[PDB]
Amino acid sequence: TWLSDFPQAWAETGGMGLAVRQAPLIIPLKATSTPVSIKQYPMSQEARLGIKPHIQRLLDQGILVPCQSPWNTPLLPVKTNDYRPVQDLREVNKRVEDIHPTVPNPYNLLSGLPPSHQWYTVLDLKDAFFCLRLHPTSQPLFAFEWRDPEMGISGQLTWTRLPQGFKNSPTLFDEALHRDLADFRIQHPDLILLQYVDDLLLAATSELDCQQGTRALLQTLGNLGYRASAKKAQICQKQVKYLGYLLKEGQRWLTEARKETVMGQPTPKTPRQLREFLGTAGFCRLWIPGFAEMAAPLYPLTKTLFNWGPDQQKAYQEIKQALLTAPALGLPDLTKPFELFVDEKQGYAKGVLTQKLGPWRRPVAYLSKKLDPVAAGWPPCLRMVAAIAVLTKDAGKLTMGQPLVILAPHAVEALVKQPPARMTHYQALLLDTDRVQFGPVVALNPATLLPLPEELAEAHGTRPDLTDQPLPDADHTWYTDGSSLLQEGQRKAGAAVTTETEVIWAKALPAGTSAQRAELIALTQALKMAEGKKLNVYTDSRYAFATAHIHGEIYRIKNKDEILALLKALFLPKRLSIIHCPGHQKGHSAEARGNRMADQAARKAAITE
Amino acid sequence: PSAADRNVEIWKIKKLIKSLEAARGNGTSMISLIIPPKDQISRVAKMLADEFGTASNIKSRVNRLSVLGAITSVQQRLKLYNKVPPNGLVVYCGTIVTEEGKEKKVNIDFEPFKPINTSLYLCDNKFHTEALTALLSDDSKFGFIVIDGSGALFGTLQGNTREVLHKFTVDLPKKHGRGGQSALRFARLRMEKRHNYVRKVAETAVQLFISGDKVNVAGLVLAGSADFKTELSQSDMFDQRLQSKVLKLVDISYGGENGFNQAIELSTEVLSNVKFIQEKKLIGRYFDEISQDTGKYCFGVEDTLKALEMGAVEILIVYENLDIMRYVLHCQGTEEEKILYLTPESMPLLEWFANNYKKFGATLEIVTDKSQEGSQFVKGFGGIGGILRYRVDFQ
C-alpha cells in the first residue's frame, strides 16, 4: 500500500528527483585557479561499450549535456564484467575554494536523540546529489571527454546537476536539505528528526504518531522533489539501522558493517592508512573503554620513523578486541540523575558516563582523554583530579547541565580546598555544585570500568620514585667513596666518583670536614653531574646510603649544611636508583671491580690540598 | 603472651591458609582432621579405624588407595603423641601435585592457641581450612577516654558490644564570675583546676588499664571537646606506660556517655587496623633512628644476619614478601655453609626467621607496603633490617 499511496516519493515509481525549492549552485574557486584539461584515459572496447547505457540514460534524463570547455577530466571504468563510469575530480577539488563542513560527527548528532521516542522510521535518498542543479556558470568546470572508436564520436560532455565526487557535495546537500526540512520541523514538533546528508531518521512516541509523521514526511519529500528508496527504507519499526548504528528500545549498538569497515582494513604500515584507521575508529571511541590509553602507542606514528613494535601490534589488537566486545549504550534521557565513574593511569584519563536502569547502571558513553604535559607531571591524587575534571567538561556536552554524581578510587573532594595555581579553572566546573556532585570512593573493573562492591584522606606526600633497583636501561655505573680520618699526621679529606675502568671525577676537601661527611660530599657531587642519563650510584659507606635514602625527610640533628644540599640534589636525574654494594668490596666480580676502583681513587687522589 | 610474638604465629597461620588452598589432589584424597583439647585420643584412634572399614567399601581404586594410605598415615602420627596438650591438635594429611609433576605427601600436625569446641573431620578432593581462619577474628581489648568540662568517662570497646568502667567528674568554674576580686583572678584558677583535672585523668588511666606486668589494653583512643583534645597529646602528662599504645585522637562534642558512642562510631575503622597503625609507628621509630644518626639500625641482608648472630638486634623488621631464599648443602669437599640467593642460576628466609627469631636476638615484627612508610622501608632498604641496641661498625 505504501508505494501506491505516495507515488512521487519513491524512486521506483516517482521517477528521477529534482529539488524544486533549491536554486542552481554557483561554485566559488580560488583566485589562483585556472582551467585544467587532462588527457582522457585510452579505454578498452569491452569497457567502453559496457559504460554506454549508463551514460545514455543520463543524457535522456537531461542530466549530462554536450559542451565545449577548456576544463577536462578523465573517465575511469570500474568492474563480473559490468563496467560503470567514474570521473576522478582531484585536479578540480584541489583548485576549488573549500567550504567549512558545519556537519557535526554522526554520534553527537545521535546524541540529540531521546529514548522517549522508541518508534523509528529510516530512509535514504537514491541519487541524492543529482537533485541539486548546477548554475550554467559552473557547468563547464566538470567537463570530460567521451569517444566511440566504432563511430568517430570523440567529444566533450558535462553536468547540469551536481556531480558525484566533487568534494563539497555532501555539505552542500546537507545545508539544502536542512533548509527544506526546517519547514517540516516547525509544523511538526513532538517528533524528532535526524539527518546527515542522504540519510533520514524519524523518531516518534507511539506507532500512530510515527505513521502520520512518516506520511507527512513522505508527502513533503515528493513536494520538494527528493526521491526516497522504496527498497532500503524502514517504515514504522522498533528496531532500525541508521548511520551504522543499530537502535532498538532506547539502546544503541554498532552495526556489524560499521565494525567491519574498521575490522576489514589490513595492518596499515603507511602513515595515511594508520591516520585513517584512527580516523575511522574515532566515531567508535565512545564504545571503547579507555580509548585514550589504548591508542597511546599509535599517536607517535601520526607524524616519522614507522617502527611497528609489539606494544603497537598489541594496541592495534586491543582495539579490534574492544570493537568485538562493544556493548549496548543507552540514549541520554535527561530526567534521571547521571553517574560518571573515572580512573587515571600512566598519564591517561578513562571513564564511563552511566545512569540508572531499574536498580542497574546502563552506560551511555565511554569518555577518555590524555592528560596534557603539565598535569601529567603531577602526583597521583592530583592527576586523578585533572582526569575527573577533563571527563566532566566533556560529559557536560551529553548531560546538558543535568544532575551528575562523580566517583573515583581516590576520594578527592577535600583536595578541591587546599592546593599548595591552575585550580581556578578546575574548581569552577567541579565545585559549581548546582549541577555537580561527588560520591562514594570505589574500585572499578579494568574491563568494564563499572563500580565494584568495595569502600585515605588526601593528606600526604614527600618523596620521588627512588628504589634499590639496578635499573633495566643500565646507564652510568658510578662508585662513590670518601676519606676523612688521620693517617701519618692529620685528617686526609678526599673524595672520588669513578667507574670500573676510568676515573671520571675526583678532588680533595677542606682540612676540616668530618669523618663520614666525605662520603656525602662525594655522592652529592656524583648526583649533580647527571640529568638525562639515568645513573645507578654504588656507595662504600653505609651512613651515606640510609640518610640519603630516607628519603627526603622533612623534620619538625646537628649537621644541616651538606644534608640540605643532598636532600635537594636528588631531584636531578630522571629515574634514579641508589644501590649500596659492599657485598663484597674485597672482592671482585663483574661489579665490585669498580667498587675497588672508587676506594683506591678517594685515598690516593686525595692528598693534594 | 607477647603481642608481637603472637602476630608472627598469626602470620604463619595466614601462610598455611595460602599454601593449603593452593595445593589440590585428585579425587577423595584430602583429610582435614581437627581435634579439640578435651576429647580423648583412643576415641579418635577408634573413629579412624571406623572410617578405614568405611573406606574399605569405597570401590574406586586410586582414591581408595589414597584414603587408606592417608588414614594409615595419621594413625601412625597420632600414636607418637600421648593424649592431648592444653590447646588441642590440628592436622592435615593428603597427596597433591607439586612442581615438575611428581607426588607430595604434606603431613601436618601441631598445637595452635585454643580451638576448644572445634571438632571437625572432612575427607574431600580439597582440604578444609575454615576452622583455622576462624582463629583470626580476635579483636583485642581496646581502651577509651572521653573528656569534657563537666566530667569524664573511662571504658572498653571489645569488637562490637560496648563496655563502661569509671564515671568520674571534677568541678571547674564556668563563665566569668566577676565578684569582689579582679578581671584576671579567675583566669589563674582555670588553668589550675584544668591541669589538676588532667593529672587526675592521667593517674586514673594509669591504674585501671595497666593492671601490672603487661598493659591489659591492646590499644587506646582519645577524645574531647576543648584543649583536652590537644593538651593530652602534646604534653606527656599522659605518658607513663600506655602512651605508646595510643591509636588516634578524636574530636567530639557532647562529652558525656553519648560522647563515648560518637567516639566508638568514628573509630571503628582504626581499631580494626591495629597492624597498619602499629606498623607505621614501628617503621616510624626505625627512620627516627637514622635521622638522629644514633646508629642503632641496620639494613640489607649481610648486615642483618650479622646483627642477629651478634645479638645486638632488639627488634627485627622484615617484609612479609621476601623473594630471597636461604640454602644449606653438602657441596663439594663434604662441608656445610649458608648462601642466601636472590636470583636463580629448603624454604623461604621469612619462614626461617618466623620459626627461629627467638634463638639469637630476639624480637620479630612483620611489615607491609600498603603503609606509606612501609612502602619506603620496602623499595628503599630491600625489606630487611632492624632496631639494634648500640653503635655498630661493619665497614
Short mmCIF file of N, CA, C and O in Angstrom, two decimals, chain A residues 480-484 494-497 505 509 513-528 537-551 557-567 569-570 578 602, chain B residues 290-291 293 297:
data_model
loop_
_atom_site.label_atom_id
_atom_site.label_comp_id
_atom_site.label_asym_id
_atom_site.label_seq_id
_atom_site.Cartn_x
_atom_site.Cartn_y
_atom_site.Cartn_z
N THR A 480 81.02 5.64 44.51
CA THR A 480 81.38 6.83 45.31
C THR A 480 81.95 6.50 46.70
O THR A 480 81.40 5.68 47.43
N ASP A 481 83.06 7.16 47.05
CA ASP A 481 83.78 6.94 48.32
C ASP A 481 84.38 8.28 48.81
O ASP A 481 84.45 9.25 48.06
N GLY A 482 84.77 8.31 50.09
CA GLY A 482 85.47 9.46 50.69
C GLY A 482 86.38 9.04 51.83
O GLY A 482 86.38 7.87 52.21
N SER A 483 87.15 9.98 52.38
CA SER A 483 88.18 9.64 53.39
C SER A 483 88.60 10.81 54.28
O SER A 483 89.42 11.63 53.85
N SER A 484 88.07 10.88 55.51
CA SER A 484 88.40 11.96 56.47
C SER A 484 88.84 11.51 57.91
O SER A 484 88.54 12.20 58.90
N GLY A 494 89.31 13.56 51.38
CA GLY A 494 89.36 13.33 49.93
C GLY A 494 88.21 12.47 49.42
O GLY A 494 87.84 11.49 50.06
N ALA A 495 87.67 12.85 48.26
CA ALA A 495 86.54 12.17 47.62
C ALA A 495 86.93 11.61 46.25
O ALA A 495 88.00 11.93 45.72
N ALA A 496 86.06 10.76 45.70
CA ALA A 496 86.23 10.20 44.35
C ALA A 496 84.90 9.62 43.82
O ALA A 496 84.11 9.08 44.60
N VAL A 497 84.68 9.75 42.51
CA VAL A 497 83.48 9.21 41.82
C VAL A 497 83.92 8.54 40.50
O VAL A 497 83.87 9.17 39.44
N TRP A 505 85.64 11.61 37.94
CA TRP A 505 85.77 12.82 38.78
C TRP A 505 86.42 12.50 40.13
O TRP A 505 86.19 11.44 40.71
N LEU A 509 89.39 17.79 49.71
CA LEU A 509 88.41 18.51 50.52
C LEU A 509 89.14 19.54 51.40
O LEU A 509 90.38 19.57 51.41
N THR A 513 86.14 19.34 57.51
CA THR A 513 85.07 18.35 57.22
C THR A 513 84.71 17.51 58.48
O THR A 513 84.57 18.09 59.56
N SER A 514 84.55 16.19 58.35
CA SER A 514 84.21 15.33 59.49
C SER A 514 85.02 14.03 59.39
O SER A 514 86.23 14.09 59.15
N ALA A 515 84.38 12.88 59.64
CA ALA A 515 84.90 11.56 59.26
C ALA A 515 84.17 11.04 58.02
O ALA A 515 84.80 10.64 57.04
N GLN A 516 82.84 11.07 58.07
CA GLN A 516 81.98 10.43 57.07
C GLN A 516 81.18 11.42 56.21
O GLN A 516 80.42 11.00 55.34
N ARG A 517 81.37 12.73 56.43
CA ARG A 517 80.81 13.76 55.55
C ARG A 517 81.40 13.65 54.15
O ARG A 517 80.72 13.98 53.18
N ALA A 518 82.65 13.20 54.05
CA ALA A 518 83.32 12.94 52.76
C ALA A 518 82.45 12.14 51.80
O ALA A 518 82.26 12.53 50.64
N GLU A 519 81.92 11.03 52.30
CA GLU A 519 81.05 10.14 51.52
C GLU A 519 79.79 10.82 51.00
O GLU A 519 79.32 10.50 49.91
N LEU A 520 79.26 11.75 51.78
CA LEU A 520 78.10 12.54 51.37
C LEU A 520 78.48 13.51 50.26
O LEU A 520 77.84 13.54 49.20
N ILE A 521 79.54 14.28 50.51
CA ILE A 521 80.01 15.30 49.57
C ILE A 521 80.35 14.67 48.22
O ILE A 521 80.05 15.26 47.18
N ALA A 522 80.93 13.48 48.25
CA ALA A 522 81.22 12.72 47.03
C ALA A 522 79.95 12.28 46.31
O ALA A 522 79.89 12.33 45.08
N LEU A 523 78.94 11.84 47.07
CA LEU A 523 77.67 11.38 46.49
C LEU A 523 76.80 12.52 45.96
O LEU A 523 76.18 12.38 44.91
N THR A 524 76.72 13.62 46.72
CA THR A 524 76.04 14.82 46.25
C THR A 524 76.58 15.18 44.87
O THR A 524 75.84 15.20 43.89
N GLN A 525 77.90 15.40 44.83
CA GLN A 525 78.67 15.71 43.61
C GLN A 525 78.47 14.68 42.49
O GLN A 525 78.29 15.07 41.33
N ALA A 526 78.47 13.39 42.83
CA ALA A 526 78.17 12.31 41.88
C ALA A 526 76.76 12.41 41.30
O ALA A 526 76.50 11.91 40.20
N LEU A 527 75.87 13.04 42.06
CA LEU A 527 74.46 13.21 41.69
C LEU A 527 74.14 14.56 41.05
O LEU A 527 73.06 14.74 40.49
N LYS A 528 75.08 15.51 41.13
CA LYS A 528 74.99 16.76 40.38
C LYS A 528 75.16 16.45 38.89
O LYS A 528 74.25 16.69 38.09
N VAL A 537 74.12 4.61 41.50
CA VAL A 537 75.31 5.01 42.27
C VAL A 537 75.57 4.04 43.43
O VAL A 537 74.72 3.86 44.29
N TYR A 538 76.77 3.43 43.42
CA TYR A 538 77.23 2.50 44.47
C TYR A 538 77.93 3.26 45.59
O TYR A 538 78.79 4.09 45.31
N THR A 539 77.60 2.95 46.84
CA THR A 539 78.17 3.65 47.99
C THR A 539 78.95 2.68 48.86
O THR A 539 78.45 1.63 49.22
N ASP A 540 80.18 3.05 49.20
CA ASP A 540 81.02 2.22 50.07
C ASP A 540 80.63 2.38 51.54
O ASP A 540 80.67 1.40 52.29
N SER A 541 80.27 3.60 51.94
CA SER A 541 79.83 3.90 53.31
C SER A 541 78.31 3.75 53.44
O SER A 541 77.54 4.13 52.54
N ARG A 542 77.91 3.21 54.59
CA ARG A 542 76.52 2.82 54.86
C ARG A 542 75.73 3.91 55.58
O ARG A 542 74.50 3.91 55.52
N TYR A 543 76.42 4.83 56.25
CA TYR A 543 75.80 6.07 56.74
C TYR A 543 75.27 6.93 55.59
O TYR A 543 74.21 7.54 55.70
N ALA A 544 76.04 6.98 54.50
CA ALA A 544 75.67 7.75 53.31
C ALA A 544 74.36 7.26 52.69
O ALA A 544 73.46 8.05 52.46
N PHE A 545 74.27 5.96 52.45
CA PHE A 545 73.08 5.33 51.86
C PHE A 545 71.78 5.69 52.59
O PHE A 545 70.92 6.37 52.03
N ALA A 546 71.68 5.28 53.86
CA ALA A 546 70.44 5.37 54.65
C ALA A 546 69.92 6.80 54.77
O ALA A 546 68.80 7.07 54.35
N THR A 547 70.75 7.71 55.30
CA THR A 547 70.39 9.14 55.39
C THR A 547 69.93 9.65 54.04
O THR A 547 68.90 10.32 53.95
N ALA A 548 70.67 9.29 53.00
CA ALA A 548 70.32 9.65 51.62
C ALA A 548 69.11 8.91 51.04
O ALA A 548 68.58 9.34 50.02
N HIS A 549 68.69 7.82 51.67
CA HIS A 549 67.58 7.02 51.17
C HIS A 549 66.37 7.04 52.12
O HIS A 549 65.61 6.08 52.15
N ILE A 550 66.18 8.14 52.87
CA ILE A 550 65.14 8.17 53.92
C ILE A 550 64.14 9.38 54.05
O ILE A 550 63.88 9.81 55.17
N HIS A 551 63.57 9.94 52.97
CA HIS A 551 64.11 9.94 51.61
C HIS A 551 65.30 10.91 51.59
O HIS A 551 66.42 10.43 51.46
N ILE A 557 69.31 16.74 65.40
CA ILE A 557 70.16 16.76 64.21
C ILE A 557 71.01 18.04 64.14
O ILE A 557 70.47 19.15 64.20
N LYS A 558 72.33 17.88 64.00
CA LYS A 558 73.30 18.98 64.12
C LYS A 558 74.38 18.89 63.02
O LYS A 558 75.58 18.83 63.31
N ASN A 559 73.94 18.89 61.76
CA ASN A 559 74.84 18.86 60.59
C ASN A 559 74.09 19.16 59.27
O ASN A 559 74.24 18.45 58.26
N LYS A 560 73.32 20.25 59.28
CA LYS A 560 72.32 20.54 58.23
C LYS A 560 72.91 20.88 56.85
O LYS A 560 72.26 20.61 55.83
N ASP A 561 74.11 21.47 56.82
CA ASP A 561 74.72 22.05 55.59
C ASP A 561 74.74 21.07 54.40
O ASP A 561 73.93 21.19 53.48
N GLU A 562 75.68 20.13 54.45
CA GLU A 562 75.78 19.04 53.47
C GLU A 562 74.45 18.32 53.23
O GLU A 562 74.14 17.95 52.10
N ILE A 563 73.68 18.16 54.31
CA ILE A 563 72.42 17.42 54.31
C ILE A 563 71.39 18.11 53.43
O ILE A 563 70.87 17.51 52.49
N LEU A 564 71.11 19.38 53.71
CA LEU A 564 70.10 20.13 52.95
C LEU A 564 70.52 20.34 51.48
O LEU A 564 69.67 20.61 50.63
N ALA A 565 71.82 20.23 51.19
CA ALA A 565 72.32 20.18 49.82
C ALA A 565 72.01 18.84 49.17
O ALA A 565 71.57 18.78 48.02
N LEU A 566 72.27 17.77 49.91
CA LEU A 566 71.99 16.41 49.45
C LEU A 566 70.49 16.20 49.22
O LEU A 566 70.10 15.78 48.14
N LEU A 567 69.66 16.54 50.21
CA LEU A 567 68.20 16.39 50.10
C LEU A 567 67.64 16.97 48.79
O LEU A 567 66.90 16.30 48.07
N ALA A 569 69.54 17.95 46.13
CA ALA A 569 70.34 17.48 44.98
C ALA A 569 69.83 16.20 44.28
O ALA A 569 70.36 15.83 43.23
N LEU A 570 68.80 15.56 44.83
CA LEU A 570 68.35 14.23 44.37
C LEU A 570 67.22 14.25 43.33
O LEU A 570 66.89 13.20 42.77
N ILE A 578 69.66 4.48 43.79
CA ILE A 578 70.79 4.42 44.69
C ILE A 578 70.82 3.02 45.26
O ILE A 578 69.89 2.60 45.94
N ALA A 602 89.72 7.57 46.03
CA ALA A 602 89.48 8.50 47.14
C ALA A 602 90.54 8.51 48.24
O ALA A 602 90.50 9.37 49.12
N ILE B 290 67.72 6.66 62.13
CA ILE B 290 68.62 7.15 61.09
C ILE B 290 68.72 8.70 61.08
O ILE B 290 69.78 9.27 60.81
N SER B 291 67.60 9.35 61.39
CA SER B 291 67.53 10.82 61.49
C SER B 291 68.43 11.39 62.57
O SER B 291 69.20 12.32 62.32
N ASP B 293 70.99 10.01 63.71
CA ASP B 293 72.32 9.43 63.49
C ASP B 293 72.76 8.64 64.71
O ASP B 293 73.95 8.57 65.04
N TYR B 297 70.68 1.07 64.09
CA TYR B 297 69.92 0.48 62.99
C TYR B 297 70.80 -0.38 62.10
O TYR B 297 72.02 -0.36 62.23
#
